[PDB]
Design a binder for this molecule. Structure first.
Ligand SMILES: CN1CCC2(CC1)NC(=O)c1c(c3ccc(Cl)c(Cl)c3n1C)[C@H]2C#N
Length: 268
C-alpha cells in the first residue's frame, strides 16, 4: 500500500474525483504530492475517473522530461483509487498568484509565458495536446520572488494528436469540430489576456454566454485594462484568439514572436 511507503500529510487541493495530499517518502524523507484519483466502480460508471483517463495521463507523464512540466515519481493502486506520486510544487497555483497581484506588467507576463511556451513546445514536439491549459493548472515553485518558476500540471485530458474549462476552450471545442494542437494555442491567448488585465476575455454571466462569446470570438481590448498595453502584446494575443485553428500562431511562431523576445532583446 502507498501509505506503507509514503506518510500522508495535509490536503493541498481537491476536485470532483481527486484529492491531492502532501506526503513524505519514508525511505528518503523527500516530500511529494500524492494525487488520489477515484476510480469508476464499473467500467462505464457515471462517477469516477475513467480508467482510460488515468492510464493515458500516467503514460503521458512518464514520457515527458522537461523542467516546466511536473514529474511522476510512482504509482499505487488499490480497489478504489489510483494514487500518483508527483513532484511537489509548493508555491501555489498561478491562479492564486494572479489573484494577489491583480494584473501583471508585460515583463512579468512574458517571464511566465516564456516558461509556459517552453513546456508547451516540448509537448507539441511530441504531438501532445494538453487540452486544459489555464492558471489553475500552472504551479509555482516559489511565489516570493520576482521571476517565479512554473510547472504545468493536470494531464487528465491530454491526448496525442495523430471538453476542458469553459472560459479557456477554443471555438472548435465549442462547435464540435476537429481538434489538434491549436486548441492549446487558443488557451495560451486566453491566459495571456488574463495575465495582462485580470479579466477573462470571453466570460459571460452564464456558461452559455461564455461559450457563445468564444464561438463568436467576442472579446475586446477594453481601455479599462489595456490603456497602457503595447501594440506587440496585443498582436500576440490577437494572433492566438483566432477562430480558424489553421490561422492561429503555432507554438514555434509564438516563441519567435517579438513580444516574447522583447525582454531578452533590451538592456533597460
Ligand atoms: C484543475 N484544478 C487545479 C489542479 C488540481 C485539480 C483542480 N487542484 C489542486 O489543488 C492541485 C492539483 C495538483 C496536482 C499536482 C500537484 Cl503536484 C499539486 Cl501541488 C496540485 N494541486 C495543489 C490538482 C489536483 N487534484
Amino acid at each position: 500500500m502507498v501509505e506503507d511507503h509514503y506518510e500522508m500529510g495535509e490536503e493541498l487541493g481537491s476536485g470532483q474525483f481527486a484529492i491531492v495530499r502532501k506526503c513524505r517518502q519514508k525511505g528518503t524523507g523527500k516530500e511529494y504530492a500524492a494525487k488520489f484519483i477515484k476510480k469508476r466502480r464499473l467500467s462505464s460508471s457515471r462517477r469516477g475517473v475513467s480508467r482510460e483517463e488515468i492510464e493515458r495521463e500516467v503514460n503521458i507523464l512518464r514520457e515527458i522530461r522537461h523542467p516546466n512540466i511536473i514529474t511522476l515519481h510512482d504509482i499505487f493502486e488499490n480497489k478504489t483509487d489510483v494514487v500518483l506520486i508527483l513532484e511537489l510544487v509548493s508555491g501555489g497555483e498561478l491562479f492564486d498568484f494572479l489573484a494577489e497581484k491583480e494584473s501583471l506588467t508585460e515583463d512579468e507576463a512574458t517571464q511566465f509565458l516564456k516558461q509556459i511556451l517552453d513546456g508547451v513546445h516540448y509537448l507539441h514536439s511530441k504531438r501532445i495536446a494538453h487540452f486544459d491549459l489555464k492558471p489553475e493548472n500552472i504551479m509555482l515553485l516559489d511565489k516570493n520572488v520576482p521571476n517565479p518558476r512554473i510547472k504545468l500540471i493536470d494531464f487528465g485530458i491530454a491526448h496525442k494528436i495523430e471538453f476542458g474549462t469553459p472560459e479557456f476552450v477554443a471555438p472548435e471545442i465549442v462547435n464540435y469540430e476537429p481538434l489538434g494542437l491549436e486548441a492549446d494555442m487558443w488557451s495560451i491567448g486566453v491566459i495571456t489576456y488574463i495575465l495582462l488585465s485580470g479579466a477573462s476575455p470571453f466570460l459571460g454571466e452564464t456558461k452559455q454566454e461564455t461559450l457563445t462569446n468564444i464561438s463568436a470570438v467576442n472579446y475586446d481590448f477594453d481601455e479599462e485594462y489595456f490603456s497602457n498595453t503595447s501594440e506587440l502584446a496585443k498582436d500576440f494575443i490577437r494572433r492566438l484568439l483566432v477562430k480558424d485553428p489553421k490561422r492561429r500562431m503555432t507554438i514555434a511562431q509564438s516563441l519567435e514572436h517579438s513580444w516574447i523576445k522583447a525582454i531578452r532583446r533590451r538592456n533597460v
